[PDB]
Scaffold this active site. Structure first.
Site, short mmCIF file in Angstrom:
data_model
loop_
_atom_site.label_atom_id
_atom_site.label_comp_id
_atom_site.label_asym_id
_atom_site.label_seq_id
_atom_site.Cartn_x
_atom_site.Cartn_y
_atom_site.Cartn_z
N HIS A 62 4.92 22.61 -47.44
CA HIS A 62 3.79 21.80 -46.97
C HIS A 62 4.15 20.31 -47.09
O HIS A 62 5.28 19.99 -47.48
CB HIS A 62 2.49 22.14 -47.72
CG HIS A 62 2.48 21.72 -49.17
ND1 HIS A 62 3.52 22.00 -50.03
CD2 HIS A 62 1.53 21.11 -49.90
CE1 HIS A 62 3.22 21.55 -51.24
NE2 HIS A 62 2.02 21.02 -51.19
N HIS B 28 2.99 17.58 -48.89
CA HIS B 28 3.00 16.79 -50.14
C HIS B 28 4.43 16.51 -50.59
O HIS B 28 5.33 17.35 -50.42
CB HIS B 28 2.21 17.48 -51.26
CG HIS B 28 0.74 17.51 -51.01
ND1 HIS B 28 -0.10 18.44 -51.59
CD2 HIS B 28 -0.04 16.73 -50.23
CE1 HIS B 28 -1.34 18.22 -51.19
NE2 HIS B 28 -1.33 17.20 -50.36
N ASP C 63 5.88 16.63 -53.29
CA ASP C 63 6.45 17.63 -54.18
C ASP C 63 7.32 18.65 -53.41
O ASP C 63 8.12 19.37 -54.00
CB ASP C 63 5.35 18.39 -54.95
CG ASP C 63 4.23 17.47 -55.48
OD1 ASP C 63 3.81 16.51 -54.78
OD2 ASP C 63 3.74 17.74 -56.61
N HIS D 245 -4.45 25.55 -50.15
CA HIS D 245 -4.12 24.30 -50.83
C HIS D 245 -4.06 23.09 -49.87
O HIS D 245 -4.53 22.00 -50.19
CB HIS D 245 -2.80 24.46 -51.58
CG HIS D 245 -2.23 23.17 -52.07
ND1 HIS D 245 -2.77 22.47 -53.12
CD2 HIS D 245 -1.18 22.44 -51.61
CE1 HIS D 245 -2.06 21.37 -53.31
NE2 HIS D 245 -1.11 21.32 -52.40
N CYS E 162 2.40 25.82 -53.47
CA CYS E 162 1.15 25.32 -54.04
C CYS E 162 -0.07 26.10 -53.57
O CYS E 162 -1.20 25.78 -53.92
CB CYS E 162 1.01 23.83 -53.74
SG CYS E 162 2.44 22.90 -54.29
N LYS F 69 -2.14 29.82 -57.03
CA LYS F 69 -2.81 29.10 -58.10
C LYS F 69 -3.61 30.04 -59.00
O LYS F 69 -4.84 30.07 -58.94
CB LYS F 69 -3.71 28.03 -57.49
CG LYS F 69 -2.95 26.88 -56.86
CD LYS F 69 -2.33 25.96 -57.88
CE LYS F 69 -1.49 24.90 -57.19
NZ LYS F 69 -2.37 24.14 -56.23
N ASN G 117 -5.41 20.37 -57.51
CA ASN G 117 -5.90 19.25 -56.70
C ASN G 117 -6.46 19.66 -55.34
O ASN G 117 -5.72 20.16 -54.48
CB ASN G 117 -4.78 18.23 -56.54
CG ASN G 117 -5.26 16.92 -55.95
OD1 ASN G 117 -6.24 16.87 -55.21
ND2 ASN G 117 -4.58 15.84 -56.32
N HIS H 22 3.80 25.31 -59.60
CA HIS H 22 3.53 24.58 -60.83
C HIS H 22 3.32 25.47 -62.06
O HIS H 22 2.86 25.01 -63.10
CB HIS H 22 2.32 23.70 -60.63
CG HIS H 22 2.44 22.76 -59.47
ND1 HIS H 22 3.47 21.86 -59.34
CD2 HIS H 22 1.63 22.57 -58.40
CE1 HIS H 22 3.29 21.15 -58.24
NE2 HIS H 22 2.18 21.56 -57.66
O1 3R9 Z 1 -0.41 21.63 -56.31
C1 3R9 Z 1 -1.52 21.26 -56.75
O2 3R9 Z 1 -2.65 21.74 -56.55
C2 3R9 Z 1 -1.51 20.02 -57.64
C3 3R9 Z 1 -1.28 20.47 -59.10
S1 3R9 Z 1 0.18 19.59 -59.73
C4 3R9 Z 1 0.29 18.47 -58.24
C5 3R9 Z 1 -0.50 17.20 -58.48
S2 3R9 Z 1 -1.18 16.73 -56.85
C6 3R9 Z 1 -0.60 18.32 -56.05
C7 3R9 Z 1 0.69 17.99 -55.25
S3 3R9 Z 1 1.36 19.51 -54.61
N1 3R9 Z 1 -0.39 19.16 -57.19
ZN ZN Z 2 0.61 20.15 -52.59
ZN ZN Z 3 1.53 21.17 -55.81
#
Ligand code: 3R9
Ligand code: ZN
Ligand code: ZN
Ligand code: 3R9
Length: 219
Positions: free
Chosen positions: A75, A77, A79, A137, A156, A159, A165, A195
């Site tokens: 995706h 983000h 990360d 997500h 992500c 979960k 988030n 995560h």
């Molecule tokens: O993946 C998530 O929901 C959250 C938990 S740790 C990180 C901080 S903002 C998002 C970027 S994928 N992410």
């Molecule tokens: Zn994300």
């Molecule tokens: Zn994430």
């Protein structure tokens, strides 16, 4: 200071890379991706947060005789896409869905050089499959399936202990998308979240339960 990039064998021809970033309001966030080996070729499933860790990840596998054939981002983000700009500058092919690339473009970020659209896509035929379960997500989240090892990288979207988030999430759709994910990959031997720790197919159950619980709680 932040933990160093970690690389750990998960299964035959499958490694987990873990990178770390300080995120405001979250503290230190771990991020898992995979490196998948097909013969003597390597595929990045998600990039580390940074160009620095992406470079380290690449050199580790190059120094051990693997050509980096490509990366795919699950995706938009950072990360998952943080290393795309660096990979592009090395002429390593980068992949993301059309929607992921539109979202990168909208945010003024570097896009992957290759895009795909549709519900299914083979990054590598019979070896690395990409699947779009629907919004969760983020609107664009996709998962990656390794049929030969029965390993599912959920990113992500997965979960199990809470949705995290919700800034770009679609809380209305996630239960339906997670349900769809559960049906298609219920026989997963291993599920790899972004995560938290690797688990088994039950992570699909918990994600579905967490999604249902999040939509209800939102009402
Ligand atoms: O993946 C998530 O929901 C959250 C938990 S740790 C990180 C901080 S903002 C998002 C970027 S994928 N992410
Ligand atoms: Zn994300
Ligand atoms: Zn994430
Ligand atoms: O291609 C683009 O969409 C924009 C956002 S990030 C990428 C590399 S530098 C900038 C054009 S100066 N450019």
């Amino acid at each position: 200071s932040l933990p160093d990039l970690k690389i750990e064998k998960l299964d035959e021809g499958v490694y987990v890379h873990t990178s770390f970033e300080e995120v405001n309001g979250w503290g230190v966030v771990p991020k898992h991706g995979l490196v998948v080996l097909v013969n003597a070729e390597a595929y990045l499933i998600d990039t580390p947060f940074t160009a620095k860790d992406t470079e380290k990840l690449v050199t580790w596998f190059v120094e051990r005789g693997y050509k980096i054939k490509g990366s795919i981002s699950s995706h938009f983000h950072s990360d998952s896409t943080g290393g795309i700009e660096w990979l592009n500058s090395r002429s390593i092919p980068t992949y993301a869905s059309e929607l992921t690339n539109e979202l990168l473009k909208k945010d003024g970020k570097v896009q992957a050089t290759n895009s795909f659209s549709g519900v299914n896509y083979w990054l590598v035929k019979n070896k690395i499959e990409v699947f779009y379960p629907g919004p969760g997500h983020t609107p664009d989240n996709v998962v990656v399936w390794l049929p030969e090892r029965k390993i599912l990288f959920g990113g992500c979207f997965i979960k199990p202990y809470g949705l995290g988030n919700l800034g770009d999430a679609n809380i209305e759709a996630w239960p339906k998308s997670a349900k769809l994910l559960k049906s298609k990959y219920g026989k997963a031997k291993l599920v790899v979240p972004s995560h938290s720790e690797v688990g088994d197919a039950s992570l699909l159950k918990l994600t579905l339960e967490q999604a249902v619980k999040g939509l209800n709680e939102s009402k």
